[PDB]
Amino acid sequence: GAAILPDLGTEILIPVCAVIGIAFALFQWLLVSKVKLSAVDHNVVVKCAEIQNAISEGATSFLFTEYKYVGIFMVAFAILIFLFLGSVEGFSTSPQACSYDKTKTCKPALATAIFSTVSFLLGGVTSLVSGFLGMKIATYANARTTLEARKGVGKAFITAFRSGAVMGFLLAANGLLVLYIAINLFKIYYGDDWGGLFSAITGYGLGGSSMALFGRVGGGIYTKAADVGADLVGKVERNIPEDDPRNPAVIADNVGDNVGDIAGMGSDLFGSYAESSCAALVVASISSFGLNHELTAMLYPLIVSSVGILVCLLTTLFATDFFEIKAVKEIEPALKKQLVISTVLMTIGVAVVSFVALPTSFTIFNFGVQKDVKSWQLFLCVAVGLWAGLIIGFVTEYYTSNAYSPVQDVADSCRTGAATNVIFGLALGYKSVIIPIFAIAISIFVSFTFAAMYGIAVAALGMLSTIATGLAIDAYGPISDNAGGIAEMAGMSHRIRERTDALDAAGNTTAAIGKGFAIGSAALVSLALFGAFVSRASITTVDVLTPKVFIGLIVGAMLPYWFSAMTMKSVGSAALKMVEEVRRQFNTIPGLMEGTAKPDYATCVKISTDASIKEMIPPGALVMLTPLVVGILFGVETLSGVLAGSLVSGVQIAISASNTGGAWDNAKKYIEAGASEHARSLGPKGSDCHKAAVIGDTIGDPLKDTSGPSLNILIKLMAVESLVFAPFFATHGGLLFKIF
Amino acid sequence: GAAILPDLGTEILIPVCAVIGIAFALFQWLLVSKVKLSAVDHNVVVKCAEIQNAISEGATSFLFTEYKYVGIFMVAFAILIFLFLGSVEGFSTSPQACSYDKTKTCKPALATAIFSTVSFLLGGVTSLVSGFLGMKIATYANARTTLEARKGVGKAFITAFRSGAVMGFLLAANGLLVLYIAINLFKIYYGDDWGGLFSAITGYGLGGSSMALFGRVGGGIYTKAADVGADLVGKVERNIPEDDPRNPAVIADNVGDNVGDIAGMGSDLFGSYAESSCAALVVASISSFGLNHELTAMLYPLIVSSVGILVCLLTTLFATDFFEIKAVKEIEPALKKQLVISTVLMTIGVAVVSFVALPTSFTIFNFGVQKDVKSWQLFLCVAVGLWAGLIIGFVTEYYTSNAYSPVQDVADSCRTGAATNVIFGLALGYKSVIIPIFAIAISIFVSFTFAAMYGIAVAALGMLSTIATGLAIDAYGPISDNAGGIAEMAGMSHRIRERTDALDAAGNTTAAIGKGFAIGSAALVSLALFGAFVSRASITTVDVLTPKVFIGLIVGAMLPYWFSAMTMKSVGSAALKMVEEVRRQFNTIPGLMEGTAKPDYATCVKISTDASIKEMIPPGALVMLTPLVVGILFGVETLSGVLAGSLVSGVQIAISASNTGGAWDNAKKYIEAGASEHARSLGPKGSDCHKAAVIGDTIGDPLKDTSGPSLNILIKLMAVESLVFAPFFATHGGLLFKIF
């Protein structure tokens, strides 16, 4: 049956909401443009502008290099998709019978081979745009945040958070609008073949996360090579302030925050958004909505996201206008209130959407059978994901913010040296997985029971329904990070750096929270896609206790470690190179230490450019090739094992790495700020305790910024890729078992 | 039908081989006893004896205290076993139809509740005895190895390997003799009910690992708190040598080697042997061997172990009599040759056993169906496991010896400080998992295919078929470790410490290898036990894509991390206390640093005794309570997920933790030896590079000696524990799904 909301209404609502989100982003960017500066005190304003330009040049320069390689890889890979999907039916142009209804005829498999290539390119391009737009706002807002900090934390908070919101609303609205357009264009061809339409559309998320993979790892090695190098020689060895302009690695470091923590993260969360929508859509496409051609219900996920944009617009206003921060201890709770407000409002929003966009009863495909499902049960599916998110954010804050005992004990353990700092930091991360896993598990059980793979997918989307706010609170952080870097490079008052340091500590926590959301929604969407892959591969049963599934399971569980071995070694090796270079400059450039000679920033930009562009290739290949190699050699049953294994295993290492890194960073921040008797007694800056904290912080650097966060991409990427190639693996795969 | 070897012959063979092994172990003890020393140069000899006595009292004192608690828990848990298994058939005394053959009549389930409790205590007791005996020989041989070091590497090597072999042959022969005795005693009651017999016998492994769990964690906490504290204050802060008699934590440290690395490890591997034998037995008891009451073939696992002892005896002779070590570079090669010789001899040994102790055709239970299997296939099952082991050994040496580039690169990375040393160490560990996992997967495929759970179990036994040599090369390590500590504490010459340092570094590699076999065999025996649990709980299929199974899977995967969090945080905190204590004495005891006054060793023994006894409980609780809680509250479907997930996840963190810790240690020894130019380039002792290596080494201490090697126990324990309580879970479990 049709829903309360008409098909034509849905067709208007979605693009109108995207347009509202884009408008909001422009308006915010407009307000941020009010903070004036130019490279033509007035001294401090000119210096901030010059530093900003150095950073912006470097960041724009690296992405162009990275995106050139990735773009090339994207074109090659898109050719594989066309070939492999095309070969399933020998590239025939003959229409065949609908796999979901033998009484109807569908468009040739060749059409979907073509349109999967088209949507894959759409997603990859949108993914690149998402990250590039993010970089362009961050590299614009960084120094405006610095200048605003002269007036106080609240003013600087506002411009950093407004700017983060610029990225969030652009990314969420652009991602929605592109998806909506692609669906409508594809529909012109598919007509009534909604199964094929939406099966082709799943390339969008494959493209999204494919580009995201290289974006996260490439940017990740770039930034961390610089970070670790700058910090160890500057802070640990030569006893100078963090981000000192004498330090040759500082420009690369701050460019790094934009290239990794911003551009990479943007592409990454886009991949999340794209895959979840696409996952909800394919399952619906052969459920009652798709079979009965009911557009409003079919596009329920896009209606959920449309309303999410609106709810986040409102929520944003609380931190942007209705409240002002006057004290440092108000920052993290401000950020947290963004989560709390958006969740409570979105819960209402989703109730409304579920009331008017869904018929009260319908069926969801469930491994061959149409399962009876009620609209209130579907509301619980998206709401359990939405709430799992918040729980995850709360626990993550507790484990990464220096307002709480876990991180303060990590800082306190520095009193006995770096070895105890690291033992405590590792244990913290390990311990932190427990409640998010329980939350994920509860999410899976409810959504699975109520509505199978559709329910689970709509739970992932629910966790990502407030993505504009999520990106805002997250993008806020590297912008605040640069702001302090520019503050120090511009020789500003110590009072400025203290303010930026407060903002930056909050960003460390907010970044950990963002990783929590990525890993959570990744676990959810990957399960859904895995389930869909099983049907699409004509697997009757994924039975753990078969040789083929089990060998897949144990090898799948090892992939996240193989992947982490590569990325850790890359950072370690580039970092070592970076230390040698920074030492060489301090040791042989007359007056560098004196501050009467300028350092060579370009060489450090070069060390991390060379390492990242080269070393992003093997882990990208590990992830992308695995489904193809396992699928073609071992078959769909073994790929099944591999999907379940890498999901349940990858999730643990992802969470503990991101949180351990976060903890070390904020433990260091706590010693740096000395804002309590306990903190002061670990100080001052330069003390053996501080240096021990720096050691932990830098070990945590690759953990939380290269390997850890990329892991959620490994997991979600292999799942879409597997679903997309499913018919090709089913038909032409499992060779090793066929020759024998 | 039946085999070449008559049941009488089997009944004679098995204890004969055990007694030979016990005999051999005693013989080697005599030879070692030829090295003379007494407490109440010969003055150095008296010192060595005074120190040995301190260590001996310490180790004995702790084991008695630890065993007191474990033994109590052992009694309590046995009460649960009886109660729960008893409660299935309502404690009836009447016979019932065989669980495996409705047509036949079987002994009452209550008999089985009783015999399971007997075999449990039998196993719990033999586990403690395995550990205590190891501790006795180690704490005897250590100062004897020290003294023989006055005559060169080769001499001290022999008395160290001989002494290790005493532990290996005693534990191997004793575990076998007790199991044999128990099967025969149990058979008196059971008669023709072999199902119930070997189903009762499986408690033996449950007992072994249960008691091993507390010994590994208990000892592991005791030893690493001392080790971290001693090394940090002594080496990094006070610039004194490792094991310096001024350092109040040195006696606790050297006691620790015996209490953890020997006693816990002995119990640990006893559990492995026991579970693997029992797992092979339970599947066999409902296969053609057990149905047709063919005793020889039924005891094929025990016949393999029997020949295993003989093979190992022969093998030991190559290291003890046939060859002599002249150069330190010969140590590791001698140890590795022990693995190669035994693997080759045992391959022939198993061929022979398969040819005489098996019918050419038989059937193996296979999820409800008799599966036709040929004896040349059972041969391949044990062999794949035997060779996977060797492979694992070769790979583990590659990533943990300082004679190869992985460890050498890690040491090299110390030039840029502790942060890069730790980053490289983490990466090496992650990297190391790949080939062992492949080894494990290949074994699983081959063994699963040929003979289902029986093959998998027989592949676990194959990997442990040379357990005597394994324990030998491994127990050699901590003996050498103590020997260097006694050298330093007795103030012997640098030439002496240098010789033990070389033995010790080899011991480091040898210990990582032991961990390999533990993790490898644990994966196999757990998968087998998992499969038996599935049948025993009347599960039709373990479907990954069901709400019940998947929440099990993801949660199960989280548990190894939860366990690692507890055990790392415990060492971290105890170590923090230890450091403060050592500093206290150095700072407030006059003439202590100068060597005029005695340190109080007892305060450090107390910190670590207090920490371990207290902090071993929650991890034990987590592992023991988990099957009960999930089985009772959630049901056998979910417990199935928990078993699969903790297996595939646990193994990754177990291999990487042990190998990372192993690497940091040997990188440190590498610098301390200075036996190459590269090595010397990072020295001398006390350099910034050495200190950064010590940082990595002490971070590695809790990874490789507390959490890491205990994880193999976590996995294998939950597997047998689930199998034993399966009828109880199937009948009275799944409460949450029953009430709602």
Ligand SMILES: [K+]
């Ligand atoms: K940050």
Ligand SMILES: [K+]
């Ligand atoms: K050792």
Ligand SMILES: [Mg+2]
């Ligand atoms: Mg930094």
Ligand SMILES: [Mg+2]
């Ligand atoms: Mg940064």
Ligand SMILES: [Mg+2]
């Ligand atoms: Mg920074």
Ligand SMILES: [Mg+2]
């Ligand atoms: Mg930070």
Ligand SMILES: [Mg+2]
């Ligand atoms: Mg950092």
Ligand SMILES: [Mg+2]
């Ligand atoms: Mg030590």
Ligand SMILES: [Mg+2]
């Ligand atoms: Mg030791």
Ligand SMILES: [Mg+2]
């Ligand atoms: Mg030692």
Ligand SMILES: [Mg+2]
């Ligand atoms: Mg060692």
Ligand SMILES: [Mg+2]
């Ligand atoms: Mg140690």
